[PDB]
Design an enzyme around this catalytic site. Structure first.
Site, PDB file in Angstrom:
ATOM      1  N   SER A 144     -33.503  28.270  18.079  1.00 55.21           N
ATOM      2  CA  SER A 144     -34.852  27.726  18.244  1.00 55.21           C
ATOM      3  C   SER A 144     -35.441  27.233  16.923  1.00 55.21           C
ATOM      4  CB  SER A 144     -35.782  28.794  18.832  1.00 55.21           C
ATOM      5  OG  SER A 144     -37.131  28.362  18.818  1.00 55.21           O
ATOM      6  N   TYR A 158     -39.470  37.350  16.553  1.00 51.47           N
ATOM      7  CA  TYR A 158     -38.761  36.393  17.384  1.00 51.47           C
ATOM      8  C   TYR A 158     -38.249  35.265  16.483  1.00 51.47           C
ATOM      9  CZ  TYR A 158     -37.929  32.630  20.717  1.00 51.47           C
ATOM     10  OH  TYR A 158     -37.353  31.601  21.418  1.00 51.47           O
TER      11      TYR A 158
HETATM   12  N1  NDP Z   1     -38.393  27.513  26.389  1.00 51.40           N
HETATM   13  C1  NDP Z   1     -38.535  26.985  25.145  1.00 51.40           C
HETATM   14  O1  NDP Z   1     -39.397  26.236  24.728  1.00 51.40           O
HETATM   15  C2  NDP Z   1     -37.397  27.427  24.099  1.00 51.40           C
HETATM   16  C3  NDP Z   1     -36.372  28.294  24.513  1.00 51.40           C
HETATM   17  N2  NDP Z   1     -35.368  28.666  23.542  1.00 51.40           N
HETATM   18  C4  NDP Z   1     -34.272  29.599  24.011  1.00 51.40           C
HETATM   19  O2  NDP Z   1     -33.934  29.424  25.345  1.00 51.40           O
HETATM   20  C5  NDP Z   1     -33.509  30.722  25.915  1.00 51.40           C
HETATM   21  C6  NDP Z   1     -34.415  31.106  27.074  1.00 51.40           C
HETATM   22  O3  NDP Z   1     -34.394  30.209  28.204  1.00 51.40           O
HETATM   23  P1  NDP Z   1     -35.694  29.266  28.613  1.00 51.40           P
HETATM   24  O4  NDP Z   1     -35.509  28.820  27.273  1.00 51.40           O
HETATM   25  O5  NDP Z   1     -34.865  28.550  29.561  1.00 51.40           O
HETATM   26  O6  NDP Z   1     -36.193  30.762  29.127  1.00 51.40           O
HETATM   27  P2  NDP Z   1     -36.568  31.509  30.572  1.00 51.40           P
HETATM   28  O7  NDP Z   1     -36.544  30.179  31.154  1.00 51.40           O
HETATM   29  O8  NDP Z   1     -37.457  32.174  29.668  1.00 51.40           O
HETATM   30  O9  NDP Z   1     -35.076  32.125  30.602  1.00 51.40           O
HETATM   31  C7  NDP Z   1     -34.799  33.484  30.032  1.00 51.40           C
HETATM   32  C8  NDP Z   1     -33.348  33.741  30.441  1.00 51.40           C
HETATM   33  O10 NDP Z   1     -32.659  34.805  29.712  1.00 51.40           O
HETATM   34  C9  NDP Z   1     -32.584  35.920  30.447  1.00 51.40           C
HETATM   35  N3  NDP Z   1     -32.916  37.118  29.796  1.00 51.40           N
HETATM   36  C10 NDP Z   1     -33.983  37.439  28.954  1.00 51.40           C
HETATM   37  N4  NDP Z   1     -33.941  38.667  28.546  1.00 51.40           N
HETATM   38  C11 NDP Z   1     -32.811  39.222  29.125  1.00 51.40           C
HETATM   39  C12 NDP Z   1     -32.201  40.506  29.084  1.00 51.40           C
HETATM   40  N5  NDP Z   1     -32.657  41.581  28.395  1.00 51.40           N
HETATM   41  N6  NDP Z   1     -31.022  40.724  29.816  1.00 51.40           N
HETATM   42  C13 NDP Z   1     -30.501  39.669  30.544  1.00 51.40           C
HETATM   43  N7  NDP Z   1     -31.006  38.459  30.628  1.00 51.40           N
HETATM   44  C14 NDP Z   1     -32.173  38.269  29.893  1.00 51.40           C
HETATM   45  C15 NDP Z   1     -33.408  35.714  31.743  1.00 51.40           C
HETATM   46  O11 NDP Z   1     -32.970  36.521  32.819  1.00 51.40           O
HETATM   47  P3  NDP Z   1     -33.976  36.927  34.069  1.00 51.40           P
HETATM   48  O12 NDP Z   1     -35.408  36.695  33.679  1.00 51.40           O
HETATM   49  O13 NDP Z   1     -33.429  37.765  35.158  1.00 51.40           O
HETATM   50  O14 NDP Z   1     -34.078  38.164  33.277  1.00 51.40           O
HETATM   51  C16 NDP Z   1     -33.237  34.169  31.934  1.00 51.40           C
HETATM   52  O15 NDP Z   1     -32.086  33.646  32.537  1.00 51.40           O
HETATM   53  C17 NDP Z   1     -33.582  31.702  24.716  1.00 51.40           C
HETATM   54  O16 NDP Z   1     -32.310  31.783  24.043  1.00 51.40           O
HETATM   55  C18 NDP Z   1     -34.701  31.055  23.943  1.00 51.40           C
HETATM   56  O17 NDP Z   1     -34.931  31.583  22.636  1.00 51.40           O
HETATM   57  C19 NDP Z   1     -35.407  28.179  22.216  1.00 51.40           C
HETATM   58  C20 NDP Z   1     -36.462  27.323  21.891  1.00 51.40           C
HETATM   59  C21 NDP Z   1     -37.504  26.892  22.770  1.00 51.40           C
HETATM   60  C1  TNE Z   2     -42.191  28.128  19.031  1.00 46.12           C
HETATM   61  N1  TNE Z   2     -42.697  27.784  20.402  1.00 46.12           N
HETATM   62  C2  TNE Z   2     -41.693  28.111  21.432  1.00 46.12           C
HETATM   63  C3  TNE Z   2     -40.683  26.911  21.453  1.00 46.12           C
HETATM   64  C4  TNE Z   2     -41.475  25.714  20.866  1.00 46.12           C
HETATM   65  C5  TNE Z   2     -42.874  26.323  20.555  1.00 46.12           C
HETATM   66  C6  TNE Z   2     -43.810  26.055  21.784  1.00 46.12           C
HETATM   67  C7  TNE Z   2     -43.479  27.028  23.027  1.00 46.12           C
HETATM   68  O1  TNE Z   2     -44.022  26.846  24.119  1.00 46.12           O
HETATM   69  C8  TNE Z   2     -42.428  28.232  22.826  1.00 46.12           C
END
Ligand code: NDP
Ligand code: TNE
Ligand code: NDP
Ligand code: NDP
Ligand code: NDP
Ligand code: TNE
Ligand code: TNE
Ligand code: TNE
Lengths: 274, 274, 274, 274
Positions: A144, A158
């Site tokens: 990220s 984070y």
């Molecule tokens: N959304 C954004 O703007 C950004 C996202 N990211 C990265 O993207 C990823 C998250 O996805 P989105 O981004 O799609 O997030 P959500 O759409 O927040 O997806 C979270 C995902 O990870 C899983 N997860 C979280 N904690 C656990 C745990 N303890 N055990 C198992 N599964 C877990 C969830 O499983 P379910 O909920 O069952 O648990 C789900 O599939 C991370 O790596 C995040 O840092 C990076 C930058 C920006």
């Molecule tokens: C840092 N922060 C994370 C990823 C981009 C920015 C905006 C948001 O909604 C979540």
């Protein structure tokens, strides 16, 4: 195409992980989709099935990626069913919130934050290694922009977990390429997923947020908030030896241009002189 | 696919530019291939034809990318024949050598070096802009790891031209995305092309060099010297709105892991203690 | 001068911390020196006394920076003896070794490495804040080139911990500056100290290692291995608001130029052609 | 102290250069101050004289740093009056404006911007080298956060020139260190000087602009706009081998934290939800 490839996508019960999983599947891969939320995991499975992918090419596992047995379950079931592992996508992650912010966030929040966003990546990498080297496979981590180069003082743990992730991507990339496995990463900017929802924001509020930043050029120059598929496409590209073979230990930034804008640049000269 | 897309690839009479051109063509693009060496330009054309691409989908232009009339010729002929421009690939470049090295290289060498590796990029960008915005197209610049973060003291002007290029990629990306055009870049590591030949090395010597670094892990961790196609694949990916839409103003490093190794790391502890 | 300044230097029982401590003391600061090894801590105190500094200006505290008990003693003793805290330098750190290496090092080594090199910094920062905002004080963290941009695959956790530190420096800098406290850092390269000894190398092996890299320009371009004082000087500059007031959330790299050399550059053209 | 040190500060007829010049002089150095505007150069000389420095210690030279004639006079007069050169600080620079902006600025503005901000540095470096290796001297370049990592699309050539400078600092640092000369740089953020005036803004508009950004934390987190002295201090630290000897080929960022803020961070969550 990823025809026959065995792919493990952690955190594929929602957002980026989900999109990536359906893409891999549409590309002919046998995919292990996993998460904790049984209903959402099922939804991912159904989207894959709806894509015309046979159920036998899908291994859905309900597990907590931070639990040893959960990790083992993810890996063992994929080995038992597909008999090998080609790609590991360490996508699972979240900005754990407990109500506190800034440098005042408790160390307990730091421990849990790193447990998920970093330690779990180390563990999956260590437990998947040997199998990836037998197939000369790939690892794609999802970091990220919160890692830097700007400060993200509101949630230091984070932000720092991701920063640690980046150097881990470089370390494991140079160490593991010796045995034929490539390691790279993607550093997403804002992406409209369930990310804010997991932080406690109601869908209505998360929508308002993604919509606002997506329409402000000083927030996201590209003109729209990121979509899971946009990040998934790059994860897939990096997981494709045939196309990105010469990219090693890098995390490509995909933020619609957000990190290219300074806070000072949000004011234009004229308006300041008025 | 780039079906119907009008693509201009500068420096496509050899190396990376050539590979990229054939890929774009194989993907259904109308391509403008250009260079100064008539024989090699023809060779590129023949490779495209041999790929089954009809001659009318190829616009070969003999020109010097640093000459105004040459630039105009490249752009005008592509507009006349394809009637539009979708993608501009500023690939033409070289580490101009005059026999001198280090900080002692003459300013005249600096002027020529920047004239080609930087000023020509500015000019092609300015002359192509308006057409790219009418198609909401793309620009992909080809930089180099020589820009940093390590020092490349033996040829400072070439290194600095690329460093300038990188910030130009960011500047034009943020300015041009307002009008719908995306700008990104690729920073290649060592690639076995005609690059060393252009510096004065006989084929036999350039081969020995590429072969040596390609076999030394401390030189190129990936285990092989870069191939033009490996860089071309990433140029194409970045030129594909559909897949890399959320990547803006970035230059992805493709060096087989070279920049991830320090000079100090070429010695292992044991051997030093012996 | 640091006349009227109360300074806490963790890890001042040896190496960089020791040097920093003596300079601060020489500049008229009330100094709190600490470590776990009482013998070496005494040696530090001794050098400060020999420098003409009065014993009432030096507060030696035996403590483990990773234990809450040690942290509280470090802080409370300074507040009790000096009445306030103006500067906090998080210097304590080490590349913990257990005999294992590369991506195979156990998570247990990871946990211990982060508790010392990262969590101890979080904790000392959280516990000293209040007093630092009271005096509009400073914070100087000591990182390492081990965080990047190159990979350090032999010891990932130590490398990643430092990478996390760097983002922490940035986060707290932007967060604490609004309360008047400056946060910066220095990222040293190789410096002849007790660092290698702590890793398990006998003084003879250590001296050999340090002498070797200090004599090879592809290792340390500057011509010598870094000395504690060279890093202490920059820590002191960053701790002097009167001089570095405009530097915020930055970590200046002091490695005698090591990170400016690629592993590939260790081979000159002519050597390869033969 | 710089007692027995001969220092050349280009662009010392105003702003940062002026401040640097007075500090060096106060530290007992023989100083050569230069610029094109004789009135302002005199003002600099005057401040140095008022600081108690004897006129025989100050060598004022009217010259255009971009002209060979000016460069030779700057160097020769110092050598003739002081017999040697120990330190060279390439401070002269400006964001040349012609009324145009963005990627539309003409190549003519590009050529002029690079001749001053980059070529003049190459030339002064080449012409001073010999004398600097004679005294095992120093070189301090003045860049700008304008080089990156953020985009500065309004004035690409000034931004890119600084980006080229940074790689030049690294290249010459690694090249000249083998001859005993250290090369470093400082990348300032916003600093209230004559910079904006040179761009065409009346003093009233300039003061307004500087006051505004200095009062908004999303602009300059530190709480005030930078002052010439704040940058001069770090230039002097880097020019003092006795203190910064281990820092090589680095450019320390002094922007009061500006580059640590994203444009997206200028909006807080609650404001968006309403
Ligand atoms: N959304 C954004 O703007 C950004 C996202 N990211 C990265 O993207 C990823 C998250 O996805 P989105 O981004 O799609 O997030 P959500 O759409 O927040 O997806 C979270 C995902 O990870 C899983 N997860 C979280 N904690 C656990 C745990 N303890 N055990 C198992 N599964 C877990 C969830 O499983 P379910 O909920 O069952 O648990 C789900 O599939 C991370 O790596 C995040 O840092 C990076 C930058 C920006
Ligand atoms: C840092 N922060 C994370 C990823 C981009 C920015 C905006 C948001 O909604 C979540
Ligand atoms: N090879 C490597 O290891 C690396 C290459 N790069 C970049 O790749 C590009 C060069 O390609 P390879 O890399 O394939 O190089 P060669 O294989 O060296 O290709 C050079 C290409 O650019 C053209 N070219 C050079 N100068 C001019 C000019 N004045 N006018 C018109 N065309 C010109 C050549 O045309 P023809 O000879 O007729 O003139 C040819 O097509 C540059 O942008 C370079 O910096 C970046 C990093 C590493
Ligand atoms: N030496 C090098 O080449 C480099 C060093 N660094 C940084 O420098 C610091 C280490 O100093 P040098 O560099 O001088 O190292 P040593 O000379 O290795 O010094 C280690 C210092 O930290 C203390 N320390 C270590 N662990 C603990 C602990 N659990 N509790 C309390 N104190 C502890 C030691 O105290 P005593 O043993 O009693 O406990 C000692 O004063 C670290 O922050 C390190 O990452 C960064 C880059 C390179
Ligand atoms: N001010 C700011 O916010 C920032 C400034 N910088 C850097 O600081 C330097 C400029 O100083 P300040 O910053 O003090 O700027 P002004 O206060 O703008 O100072 C410009 C200085 O350079 C000289 N100069 C400019 N052009 C020439 C020329 N052709 N020949 C000789 N001297 C010349 C001026 O001399 P006189 O006019 O006689 O010619 C004067 O001493 C540049 O290197 C700039 O990029 C970097 C980041 C931010
Ligand atoms: C800098 N230099 C360029 C590109 C990588 C490296 C090796 C080479 O052969 C040419
Ligand atoms: C920075 N420096 C490098 C790698 C870790 C540390 C100790 C050493 O001796 C070499
Ligand atoms: C660094 N600083 C920024 C952009 C250019 C320079 C002058 C200014 O006033 C704001």
């Amino acid at each position: 195409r990823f025809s026959g490839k065995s792919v493990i996508i952690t955190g594929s019960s929602n957002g980026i992980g989900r999109s990536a999983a359906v893409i891999f599947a549409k590309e002919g891969a046998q995919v292990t989709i996993t998460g904790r939320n049984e209903d959402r995991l099922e939804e991912t499975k159904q989207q894959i099935l709806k894509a015309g992918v046979p159920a036998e090419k899908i291994n859905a596992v309900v597990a907590d990626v931070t639990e040893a047995s959960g990790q083992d379950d993810i890996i063992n079931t994929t080995l038992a069913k597909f008999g090998k592992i080609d790609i590991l996508v360490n996508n699972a992650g979240a900005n754990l919130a407990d109500g506190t912010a800034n440098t005042d966030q408790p160390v307990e929040l730091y421990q849990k934050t790193f447990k998920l966003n970093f330690q779990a990546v180390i563990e999956m990498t260590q437990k998947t290694k040997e199998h990836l080297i037998k197939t000369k496979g790939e690892i794609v981590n999802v970091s990220s922009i919160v890692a830097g180069p700007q400060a993200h003082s509101g949630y230091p743990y984070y932000a720092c977990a991701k920063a640690a992730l980046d150097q881990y991507t470089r370390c494991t990339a140079i160490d593991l390429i010796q045995h034929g496995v490539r390691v790279n990463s993607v550093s997403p900017g804002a992406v409209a997923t369930g990310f804010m929802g997991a932080m406690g924001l109601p869908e209505t509020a998360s929508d308002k947020l993604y919509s606002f930043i997506g329409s402000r050029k000083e927030c996201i120059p590209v003109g729209h908030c990121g979509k899971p598929e946009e990040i998934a496409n790059i994860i897939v590209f990096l997981a494709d030896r045939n196309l990105s073979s010469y990219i090693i230990g890098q995390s490509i930034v995909a933020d619609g241009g957000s990190t290219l804008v300074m806070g000072m640049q949000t004011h234009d000269l004229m308006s300041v002189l008025s």
